[PDB]
Structure 1
Amino acid sequence: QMTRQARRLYVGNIPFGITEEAMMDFFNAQMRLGGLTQAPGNPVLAVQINQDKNFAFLEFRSVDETTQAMAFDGIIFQGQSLKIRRPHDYQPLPGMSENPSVYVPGVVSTVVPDSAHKLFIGGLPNYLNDDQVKELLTSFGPLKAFNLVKDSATGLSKGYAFCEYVDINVTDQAIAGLNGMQLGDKKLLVQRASVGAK
């Protein structure tokens, strides 16, 4: 019921062509290797893929492993940052908090909250994947959050992104270092996202 929705997650921005088996094997292996499972065996029970909108719902064997799984928001799978979110009709169970107790080194969250230091990157070649765009930005250091915007129709980048660095103080060096860089046949725009936000 309510309990089943506390055992499901939306997984968006899934790569083209992924089977249910590959998604399951990836999550099961990574959760166990990552130490996120709380009992022996595989934590994922089921996977339902919608290839038309590039998302899956994952179903887990337990409520607490579902919550821990949210620490994989932004994990890279075949070059793409998976977006992990609660079901819209999730309601937390009494005596449970809805966010995880664990941080997985190297996972960069896809949630980029509005802030003084959040950046907008525009002008990206739209054939560069999430990891390839992250590798660009991380020439100024580790990212704290990042999302590349995709076109729900080409299965493809709309050519702009948002991010936030771990180090506050690199923000101006990043704009300075990237604003206007030529990239194949296009020049980069980089600025604080508050500047062109509708």
Structure 2
Amino acid sequence: AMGNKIYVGGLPTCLNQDQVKELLQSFGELKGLNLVMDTNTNLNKGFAFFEYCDPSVTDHAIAGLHGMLLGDRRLVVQRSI
């Protein structure tokens, strides 16, 4: 039982996953980030899926990360579907 994948539905198309990953890593060590991108435009779909190195960070991360990002743009963070 090692599956604590997180969903962020607040990806700005103005930035790349490298930017968001760094924001996600603010809560803990990132183990993997899947930015769902539109291969036609090379832009983000507006959401991504990630997971920390530690499974316990997940619950702690969502708690603060849900609604955290500079400006009007924000991250909708929750357990991934």
SS in 2 for 1:183: coil
8 Å contact 1:124–1:183 — kept in the other structure? no
| Residue 175 (str. 1) matches residue 62 (str. 2) | yes
The share of aligned pairs that are identical, in percent, is 61
Q: Offset of 1:182 from its aligned partner?
A: 4.5
| Residue 136 (str. 1) matches residue 23 (str. 2) | yes
Distance in 1 between residues matched to 2:71 and 2:11, nearest whole Å: 9
Pick from 11, 30, 44 the counterpart of residue 124 of structure 1.
11
Q: TM-score, normalised by structure 1?
A: 0.38
8 Å contact 1:181–1:188 — kept in the other structure? yes
SS in 2 for 1:134: helix
SS in 2 for 1:140: coil
Q: Offset of 1:149 from its aligned partner?
A: 1.1
SS in 2 for 1:131: helix
Higher relative contact order (CA 8 A, sep 6+): 2
> What is the correspondence of 1:39-188 to structure 2 with a 5 Å cutoff?
115=3, 117-188=4-75
Distance in 2 between residues matched to 1:188 and 1:133, nearest whole Å: 9
Larger relative strand fraction? 2
Q: Give the alignment's Cα RMSD to 1 decimal.
A: 1.7
Q: TM-score, normalised by structure 2?
A: 0.85
SS in 1 for 2:25: helix
SS in 2 for 1:139: coil
SS in 2 for 1:168: coil
The superposition leaves residues 9-45 of structure 1 with CA deviations (integer Å, 9 ceiling, x where unpaired) of xxxxxxxxxxxxxxxxxxxxxxxxxxxxxxxxxxxxx
Aligned to 2:76: 189
Runs of 4+ in 1 over 6 A off after TM superposition: none
Q: Which letter does structure 2 place at the counterpart of 1:128?
A: L
| Larger Rg over CA atoms | 1
Larger relative helix fraction? 1
